[PDB]
Amino acid sequence: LDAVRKRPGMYIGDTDDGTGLHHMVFEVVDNAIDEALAGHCKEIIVTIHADNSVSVQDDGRGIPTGIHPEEGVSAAEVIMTVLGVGVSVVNALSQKLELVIQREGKIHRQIYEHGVPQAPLAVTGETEKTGTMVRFWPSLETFTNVTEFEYEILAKRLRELSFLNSGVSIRLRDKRDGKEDHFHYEG
């Protein structure tokens, strides 16, 4: 997790032309699409926030929250902090990352900063629903020159993804200007 911070282009792509930056999104989206291909997730929402963060929400099972017997911390944290390339790469290159899991009746929440958990995964409330929400703020120490997310890049890729994932609702939302798209292919 520190080799990643020192040579990020190897892991994420060009950190100066926007390629790496948008691949951060797609790596999180991949995690959600994995749940859809296994048949558990029917809806994904990608949101570009106005504070330079992107969130990806899915309605799958939720990342397992029980304690990993080998590692001694929640399985979710194990996924976020141990070496597509992996969601831990995104976590490593994010100055902040918010993880919210809905699973087994309980809402779980955890905050990271540069891949380092600020506290253990914690139960915060109760929920009928299930799914994973990941919201990340890319680090401007890593990402240079191109520092804004670009709607059309995200839209083009997500549209491309809908065709490979039948019956999966993929919504893109931009809170900067209200733009909104919905890719839902059913063939």
Ligand SMILES: O=C(O)c1cc2ccccc2o1
């Ligand atoms: O219920 C499970 O075994 C489960 C849910 C899930 C979500 C993301 C990654 C792995 C996962 O495993």
